Amino acid sequence: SSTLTPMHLRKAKLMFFWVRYPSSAVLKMYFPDIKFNKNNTAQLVKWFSNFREFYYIQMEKYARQAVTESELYRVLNLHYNRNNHIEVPQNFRFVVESTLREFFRAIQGGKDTEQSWKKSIYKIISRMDDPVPEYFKSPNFLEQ
DNA sequence: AGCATGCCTG
DNA sequence: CAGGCATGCT
Numbered sequence A: 001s002s003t004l005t006p007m008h009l010r011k012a013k014l015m016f017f018w019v020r021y022p023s024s025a026v027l028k029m030y031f032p033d034i035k036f037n038k039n040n041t042a043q044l045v046k047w048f049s050n051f052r053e054f055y056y057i058q059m060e061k062y063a064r065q066a067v068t069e070s071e072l073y074r075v076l077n078l079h080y081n082r083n084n085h086i087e088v089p090q091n092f093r094f095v096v097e098s099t100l101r102e103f104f105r106a107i108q109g110g111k112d113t114e115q116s117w118k119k120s121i122y123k124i125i126s127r128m129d130d131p132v133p134e135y136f137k138s139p140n141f142l143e144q
Numbered sequence B: 001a002g003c004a005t006g007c008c009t010g
Numbered sequence C: 001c002a003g004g005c006a007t008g009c010t
Helices: A006-015 A024-029 A038-068 A072-081 A090-108 A118-125
Strands: none
Touching: A006 A038, A006 A072, A024 A038, A038 A072, A038 A090, A038 A118, A090 A118
16 A cells, blocks of 8 residues: 555554654554655654644643643544544553643743743653554554 | 755635 | 645755
8 A cells, every 4th residue: 555544544643642753764664554655654744743733732722721720631532532442541641741731831931922932842742752552563453 | 956844724 | 634835954
């Protein structure tokens, strides 16, 4: 297969539970069924850029509504795991907290007025990827 | 140019 | 999510 099928995406979204900034080097490894090339690679990578934005958009929101002043998972889980195909790995539940803690810190400190202030947060989150489970390489995984 | 990042759009 | 565009390095 040379093209990313709609399952490849359903799959990619799941991986996001373990990795926010996967290296293209690693992405390939988890898609042995795909013969990459400038395009599909660019595309797969774009997917994650997209997964990240939605994610941070959600983080900054919850963080802000909180400052002023859970089910937020329904949101995140709906977005990346629509049919609850797998169980949300605990690491993810911690990455989330880490992320929310950072935004809350930044916002509450008004340090959110500076341009590209989210950047700091990003560098921090980028070191939190975890190794994506081995069975994600399994041809049989894509099925189910 | 030719491929990668990133922001931001619809 | 895919398109566009501005950008930065080669």
